[PDB]
Design a protein around this ligand. Structure first.
Ligand SMILES: NC(=O)CC[C@H](N)C(=O)O
Length: 243
């Protein structure tokens, strides 16, 4: 009978690729381990600290929305960075992932400043990396979703895994997302992303380990999620190879 506190950043501003689905899923799977989740809605960051944070989330918005969210988050750049370097778990989606970096470059070459928490950048083209995506991850097992991004992200940090169907971060790497200490970032989004329950359980497991509370039962029924993932895996295995 225990509790975790979740920091939910800029939900009001980041509507294009909302992380709400993942927070709902986090709550569901935590409840199955007798853990109640306390969600803190943070849209203004002055005075924010991370001593009481167990997991954080940043979703994705339009370029305009993400810039605004980034400007507000920059007020707590140093505490957020220190939390991440300390091992704080978190999940970031699309723009929320991209703007952890130094910059985001539009197709016409306009440079938008990122938070600069990690040394990487993203450049966009008008033609997007689009389609079903299947990833084999040493940590997360099979990850499935849908990608649809003009952004090409270039970084040298950990990744969520090898892409066996689709593109991932960019046209060539066949790797998706970022995995930096316990911080996760991905171009995957929407209703399918939460079906990847191992991502959710990773965040919970790491937060429980850090806090010093049990995460039991570790194994629960995942039949529905496995079935949902398999629909996408089967479809990808039947399609043209993505070149
Ligand atoms: N899907 C997106 O990237 C935003 C909306 C989309 N570009 C459209 O034309 O409707």
């Amino acid at each position: 009978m225990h509790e975790l506190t979740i920091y939910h950043f800029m939900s009001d501003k980041l509507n294009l690729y909302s992380d709400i689905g993942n927070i709902i899923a986090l709550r569901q799977r935590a409840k199955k381990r007798n853990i109640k989740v306390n969600v803190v809605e943070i849209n203004e960051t002055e005075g924010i600290t991370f001593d009481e944070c167990d997991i954080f989330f940043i979703g994705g918005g339009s370029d305009r929305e993400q810039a605004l969210a980034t400007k507000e988050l920059s007020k707590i750049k140093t505490p957020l960075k220190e939390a991440i370097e300390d091992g704080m778990p978190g999940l970031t989606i699309c723009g929320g992932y991209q703007f952890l970096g130094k910059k985001y470059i539009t197709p016409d070459g306009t440079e938008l400043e990122g938070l600069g928490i990690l040394d990487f950048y993203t450049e966009s083209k008008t033609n997007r990396l689009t389609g079903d995506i299947v990833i084999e991850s040493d940590t997360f097992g099979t990850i499935v979703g849908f990608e649809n991004h003009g952004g090409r992200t270039y970084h040298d940090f950990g990744t969520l895994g090898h892409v066996t169907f689709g593109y991932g971060n960019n046209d060539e790497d066949k790797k998706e997302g970022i995995h930096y200490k316990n911080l996760l970032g991905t171009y995957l989004h929407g209703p399918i992303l939460p079906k990847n329950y191992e991502i959710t359980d990773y965040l919970l497991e790491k937060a429980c380990e850090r806090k010093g509370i049990p995460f039991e039962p570790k194994e629960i029924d995942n039949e529905a999620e496995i079935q949902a993932k398999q629909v996408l895996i089967d479809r990808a295995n039947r399609q043209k190879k993505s070149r």
